[PDB]
Design a protein around this ligand. Structure first.
Ligand SMILES: [Mg+2]
Ligand SMILES: [Mg+2]
Ligand SMILES: [Zn+2]
Length: 607
DNA sequence: TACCCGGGCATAT
DNA sequence: TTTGATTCATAACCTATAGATATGCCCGGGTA
RNA sequence: UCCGAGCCGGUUGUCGCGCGGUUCAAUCCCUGGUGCGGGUGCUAGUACCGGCUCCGCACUAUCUAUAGGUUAUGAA
């Protein structure tokens, strides 16, 4: 449920023009940013230092103790036995780490709220990283060891001789995941490559469940997989493969958003005592520094401000909290329901139905029954958003200040070697002041805020153009193709699944549709035999490829060889078509057939 | 010796 | 479907996960 | 290492057409839109009334940190 919402506004409008209050928060967020940055490095340093004997069990108390030790040092006196025990163990390594990086204890007072926010956030990053990229990384390591890519290029594809290898590898995965118990003879028949992989996996001491696979164990107890995840990263570095960030590091020197609530407000901004704060209502207390009459603070859908914002010195994120919130202290069929097949009655009652074919270049390509075509290309989005313009300005500033040269020689932060990590800190410390000053410029934070405004305007203009073109009320049907997470090599990123959320915000229905073979059928003949693909060649469109002399095959242009679609006066011999146009026309036929009750056309049906 | 206040620390499921 | 032909660092664009404050107890320094 | 969108053709519901012609749209400064009135600012001929700009009435817009793939640059 949507129990919270956010309204992002500029720093100047959110806060009153009182200079004292603005300066105090700017200093406060900078201190918290420095504490958060060093805490992540200190946590990694502690793990690497103690990795010589055994991997420690990282908990919430571990990160909280590190934050207090960096701030107050030995001056921190926890009252709980559990926190006191962690303080004693982490104390010898915190002071040594500070000497290496030249860290100076800030001794910030009233840090209780900030430390709790940072401790939970860092623990969140640890859990999320383990859940998402443990099974993926473990299977990735297995493929690299067997050299699947090498065998694919050298061995003949689609042959029964190599299908056995795929079956052999597929069966080994169940043994690796402990889903199927291997036999004694099966272990003996393993090749030295297979035997070595099995021994290495068993060395990770992976948890086991009597009646559930390894994937279920990861969801149930993600934290227990952390010692194995760190050891897996060491195996990647040992064999020279591309390493991965096992431990999240907040290496960014750009001013990050810091959570500010009512307690932080009176302690650091207003600088009033807690006794005086309790005598003033929350709304009256916030009005002294923040203009609650601003449009960003207006209540929406029954949610209220409730005093919770995050700011980075240029943009202020005003959060709206529902009265029924938790007050702190704490699927396959559902996805199928988003498809147009289960949402047919909604389309019938719609004033107009618009089909969209997502593509890498033509992100949105719209067409309706009336034939009014509309498209939202990536070039149009980039110009309106200004990401390309911002990137050039950011690149120019780095070249002028020489920051790119300094950053290029920074060692890998993903390494597990203690000496290499120590060298990484020394190199980072060598020019830390130069990079900190460069990223302290307001442009870096301003670019984030300007991109948000440009993206919001681009989305608003896109909705307005579609409404003018197709009508005030319409229903959008989009192809199910989505390059989510995984992106093809040599191809830029593209927004695929985010359009579903955008249409939901604008109260516009968005229904998925299968794109299987929707670009290989000619609508005029409903045949796929005569469709021609990549028939013509031309010099590569990318400027660096064109200078090299590469030749690309056209993918967006297709033709139909059916004589019925042709005319006697034609000399080309084929009826040319646009790939985006073909998909939208095919989607219209599919949607119309489904609405009429005939279902998906048999030509577009899967095998 | 005893009381007050500001701040440090703990915890909610 | 889609559109193209090995390692590290810094920004971004995208996708996904998790979390998005307040009340009470005590203790030490100062004052009566 | 580069790019806006619309329309007319070569063209025929065709291009990463560095194909030809035409219109406005954005490069600094800006949280965005929607429905009402006013205040007069600009737009059209004698209340007809459409459009841009502010005023304020209320409905709506989910952000932060991290991880992964990719992109741009700097090093191999
Ligand atoms: Mg598509
Ligand atoms: Mg397409
Ligand atoms: Zn045909």
């Amino acid at each position: 449920p949507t129990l919270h919402t956010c309204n992002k506004t500029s720093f100047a409008k959110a806060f009153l023009p009182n200079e004292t209050y603005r300066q105090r928060l700017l200093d406060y967020i900078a201190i918290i940013h420095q504490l958060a940055d060093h805490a992540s490095h200190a946590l990694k340093f502690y793990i690497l230092s103690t990795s010589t004997s055994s991997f420690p069990v990282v908990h919430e108390d571990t990160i909280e103790a590190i934050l207090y030790l960096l701030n107050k040092g030995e001056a921190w006196h926890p009252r709980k036995e559990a926190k006191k025990a962690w303080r004693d163990c982490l104390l010898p390594y915190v002071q040594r780490y500070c000497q290496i990086v030249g860290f100076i204890h800030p001794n910030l007072r009233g840090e209780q709220q900030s430390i709790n926010y940072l401790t939970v956030s860092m623990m969140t990053n640890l859990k999320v990283n383990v859940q998402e990229h443990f099974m993926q990384m473990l299977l990735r390591y297995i493929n690299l060891r067997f050299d699947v890519k090498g065998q694919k290029q050298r061995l003949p594809p689609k042959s029964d001789a190599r299908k056995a290898f795929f079956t052999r590898l597929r069966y080994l995965k169940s043994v690796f995941l402990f889903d199927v118990v291997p036999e004694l003879e099966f272990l003996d028949d393993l090749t030295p490559l297979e035997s070595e992989v099995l021994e290495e996996i068993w060395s990770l001491d992976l948890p086991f469940l009597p009646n559930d696979p390894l994937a279920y164990a990861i969801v149930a107890d993600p934290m227990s997989f952390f010692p194995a995840y760190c050891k897996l990263s060491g195996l990647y570095e040992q064999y020279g493969f591309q390493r991965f960030s096992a431990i999240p590091l907040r290496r960014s020197l750009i001013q990050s958003h810091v959570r500010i609530d009512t307690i932080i407000l009176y302690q650091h901004i207003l600088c009033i005592t807690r006794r005086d704060a309790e005598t003033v209502e929350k709304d009256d207390l916030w009005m002294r520094v923040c203009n609650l009459c601003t449009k960003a603070f207006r209540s929406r859908c029954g949610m209220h401000f409730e005093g919770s914002i995050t700011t980075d010195g240029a943009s202020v994120s005003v959060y709206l909290k529902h009265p029924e919130a938790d007050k702190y202290g704490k699927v396959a069929a559902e996805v199928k329901a988003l498809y147009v097949e289960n949402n047919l009655p909604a389309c019938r009652a719609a004033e107009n139905v618009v089909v969209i074919d997502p593509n890498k270049r033509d992100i949105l390509y719209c067409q309706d029954s009336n034939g009014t075509t509309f498209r939202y290309t990536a070039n149009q989005r980039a110009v309106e958003t200004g990401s390309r313009r911002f990137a050039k300005r950011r690149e120019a500033m780095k070249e002028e200040a020489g920051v790119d040269l300094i950053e290029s020689r920074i060692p890998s932060h993903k390494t597990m070697n203690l000496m290499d990590f120590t060298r990484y800190l020394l190199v980072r410390r060598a020019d830390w002041d130069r990079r900190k000053e460069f990223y302290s410029h307001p442009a870096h934070t301003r670019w984030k805020w300007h991109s948000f405004i440009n993206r919001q305007k681009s989305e608003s203009d896109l909705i307005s153009n579609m409404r003018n073109k197709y009508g005030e009320n319409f229903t959008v049907v989009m192809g199910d193709w989505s390059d989510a997470g995984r992106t093809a090599r040599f191809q830029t990123s593209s927004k695929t699944k985010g359009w579903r959320t955008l249409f939901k915000r604008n109260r516009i229905d968005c229904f998925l549709l299968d794109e299987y073979k929707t670009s290989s059928v000619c609508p005029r003949c409903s045949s796929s035999e005569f469709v021609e693909k990549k028939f013509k060649t031309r010099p590569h469109s990318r400027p660096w490829r064109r200078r090299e002399g590469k030749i690309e095959k056209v993918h967006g242009l297709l033709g139909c060889t059916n004589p019925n679609c042709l005319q006697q006066a034609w000399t080309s011999g084929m009826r040319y078509w646009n790939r985006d146009m073909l998909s939208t026309c095919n989607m219209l036929l599919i949607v119309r057939s489904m609405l009429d009750g005939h279902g998906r056309p048999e030509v577009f049906s899967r095998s």
